[PDB]
Motif scaffolding. Sequence first.
Motif, short mmCIF file in Angstrom:
data_model
loop_
_atom_site.label_atom_id
_atom_site.label_comp_id
_atom_site.label_asym_id
_atom_site.label_seq_id
_atom_site.Cartn_x
_atom_site.Cartn_y
_atom_site.Cartn_z
N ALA A 137 2.73 14.04 -9.72
CA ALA A 137 3.81 14.99 -9.96
C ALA A 137 4.20 15.02 -11.43
O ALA A 137 4.36 16.09 -12.01
CB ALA A 137 5.01 14.64 -9.08
N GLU A 138 4.32 13.85 -12.05
CA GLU A 138 4.74 13.78 -13.45
C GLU A 138 3.67 14.32 -14.38
O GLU A 138 3.98 14.93 -15.41
CB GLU A 138 5.08 12.34 -13.81
N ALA A 139 2.39 14.12 -14.04
CA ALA A 139 1.32 14.67 -14.87
C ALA A 139 1.33 16.20 -14.82
O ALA A 139 1.29 16.87 -15.87
CB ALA A 139 -0.03 14.12 -14.42
N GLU B 46 0.82 -1.20 0.00
CA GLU B 46 0.00 0.00 0.00
C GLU B 46 0.86 1.25 0.00
O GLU B 46 0.57 2.22 -0.73
CB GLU B 46 -0.94 -0.01 1.21
N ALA B 47 1.93 1.26 0.80
CA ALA B 47 2.82 2.42 0.83
C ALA B 47 3.48 2.65 -0.52
O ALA B 47 3.54 3.79 -1.00
CB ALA B 47 3.87 2.24 1.92
N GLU B 48 3.96 1.59 -1.16
CA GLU B 48 4.66 1.78 -2.43
C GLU B 48 3.68 2.18 -3.53
O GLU B 48 4.04 2.94 -4.42
CB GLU B 48 5.42 0.51 -2.80
N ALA B 49 2.44 1.68 -3.47
CA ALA B 49 1.43 2.10 -4.43
C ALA B 49 1.08 3.58 -4.25
O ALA B 49 0.89 4.30 -5.23
CB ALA B 49 0.17 1.24 -4.29
N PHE B 50 0.97 4.04 -3.00
CA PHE B 50 0.73 5.46 -2.77
C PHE B 50 1.89 6.29 -3.29
O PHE B 50 1.69 7.38 -3.84
CB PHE B 50 0.50 5.72 -1.28
N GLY C 41 1.51 6.56 -7.00
CA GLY C 41 0.52 7.60 -7.29
C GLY C 41 1.07 9.00 -7.09
O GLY C 41 0.70 9.92 -7.83
N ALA C 42 1.93 9.18 -6.09
CA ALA C 42 2.53 10.49 -5.85
C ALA C 42 3.39 10.92 -7.03
O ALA C 42 3.22 12.03 -7.57
CB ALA C 42 3.35 10.47 -4.57
#
Lengths: 52, 53
Positions: free
Chosen positions: A25-27, A13-17, A20-21
Amino acid sequence: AEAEAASVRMRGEAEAFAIGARARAEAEQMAKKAEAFQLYQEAAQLDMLLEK
Amino acid sequence: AVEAQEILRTDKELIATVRRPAEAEAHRIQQIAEGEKVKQVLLAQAEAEKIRK
């Protein structure tokens, strides 16, 4: 087994969040790349071609 | 008559020597089988819930 399952759940869950971060940022990053690229004339395209 | 008394003695001796040890061995085998079966069932349940989680 319960401890291992909780470990896997929380780390995933932490690595998936985190994924997403960087995604957000990249978008927001690439939106301005497109905005900047919009204001390119023939001189800028010539510069890019001669740099590549 | 000597041999008849010997027949009775050897009957009782064979009883005490092989008939009762056979029953004790059967009881031991079934007790140990019960223990092993319970152990295997518990280990299988633990492994199954490990896999589920």
